[PDB]
Swiss-Prot record, chains A, B:
Inducers of expression: By hydrogen peroxide and UV irradiation. In pancreatic islets, expression increases under hyperglycemic conditions. Expression is also induced by sulforaphane, an isothiocyanate obtained from cruciferous vegetables.
Species for this entry: Homo sapiens
Molecular function in Gene Ontology: cadherin binding; copper ion binding; cupric ion binding; cuprous ion binding; cytokine binding; DNA-binding transcription factor binding; enzyme activator activity; enzyme binding
Recorded name of the encoding gene: PARK7
Sequence positions bearing Cysteine sulfinic acid (-SO2H): C105
Post-translational modification: Sumoylated on Lys-129 by PIAS2 or PIAS4; which is enhanced after ultraviolet irradiation and essential for cell-growth promoting activity and transforming activity.
Record PTM N6-succinyllysine, positions in chain: K181
Protein name: Parkinson disease protein 7
Consequence the record notes for mutating C52A: Strongly reduces chaperone activity and ability to eliminate hydrogen peroxide
Effect recorded for C52S: No effect on mitochondrial translocation neither on deglycase activity
Cofactor-binding details, from the entry: Deglycase activity does not require glutathione as a cofactor, however, glycated glutathione constitutes a PARK7 substrate.
């Protein structure tokens, strides 16, 4: 049975951090839903790329649960995720069911906002460290990808492939991740 | 004066190879136009990410010339570019004015189709090599990014950052490229 991923897309999301994981997860045969935080309408990303979501978050929630919930970064996108009661509910439910949660760049700061995964080792973009670490609820890591059980984090646009492949490995295994990796021409 | 980039977006384009260069070029202060080959409507990319172009190619052509014309890959997207008389005209005009042309993955096969840059050293995705080399009109390279004067090529999703940063270096210089690079968290 195919694994399923929910990617929550908000205004101001980092479009590289959105598209790389969506594409790589689809290469891995994961059924990915790109869900618009605000609704069904197109989303203006941080560098003005406009992406049309597959579904509203409201609708996508009804088709869960998902094997992974993915939070892209982009400071303004992460703040929008952090402010959403809907995202809070999705992440609490995911945590409660022992499902994977993955967040990149500023994205992990939404975990802090929603009190998700306290006690985990995490990374973030270097510029988001102080925000993430307010209160000392997580232990900080400078690894490019950090995985502490069901909380998987990463640092920035340039770690997005590693982040996506970690998600693929977690869901579909090392062999699949290696098979997906080779045609990407990664260094 | 800000440099200007035209990114030609066709159905079946590799969305990572589209978004990474657009985003990185915008980080570099380049004015980027994402132009829809088929018109103004949203474009369904190779892994089903849907991107809304800034303008139709028809309209974008009227606002040129551009300091770089960028051709994403994706086999089906590259074939659509290869089949377009409009793309042929844009690339001929760019070549004629001694402007940069950049193409990644299968994208360089559109240069072959339109008889652009013959005699240049080029790279492509490994799987696109035989197509690109039909006739022996280019000299093949396995470098991750290849630049032979005004023809700049690269290999795949995993070389997209290097490709984009090469474009930035060519247009705006080494210092700008290094300043843009650092916050990306590249390895």
């Amino acid at each position: 049975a195919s694994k399923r991923a929910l990617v929550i897309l908000a205004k101001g999301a980092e479009e590289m951090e959105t598209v790389i994981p969506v594409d790589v997860m689809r290469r891995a045969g994961i059924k990915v839903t790109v869900a618009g935080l605000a609704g069904k309408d197109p989303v203006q990303c941080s560098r003005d790329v406009v992406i049309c979501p597959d579904a509203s978050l409201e609708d996508a929630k009804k088709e869960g649960p998902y094997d992974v919930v993915v939070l892209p970064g982009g400071n303004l996108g992460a703040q929008n995720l952090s402010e959403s009661a809907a995202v809070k509910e999705i992440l609490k439910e995911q945590e409660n069911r022992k499902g994977l949660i993955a967040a990149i760049c500023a994205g992990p700061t939404a975990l802090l906002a929603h009190e998700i995964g306290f006690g985990s080792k995490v990374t973030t973009h270097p510029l988001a460290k102080d925000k993430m670490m307010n209160g000392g609820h997580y232990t900080y890591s400078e690894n490019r990808v950090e995985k502490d059980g069901l909380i998987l984090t990463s640092r920035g646009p340039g770690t997005s492939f590693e982040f996506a492949l970690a998600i693929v490995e977690a869901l579909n295994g090392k062999e699949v991740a290696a098979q997906v990796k080779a045609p990407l021409v990664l260094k």
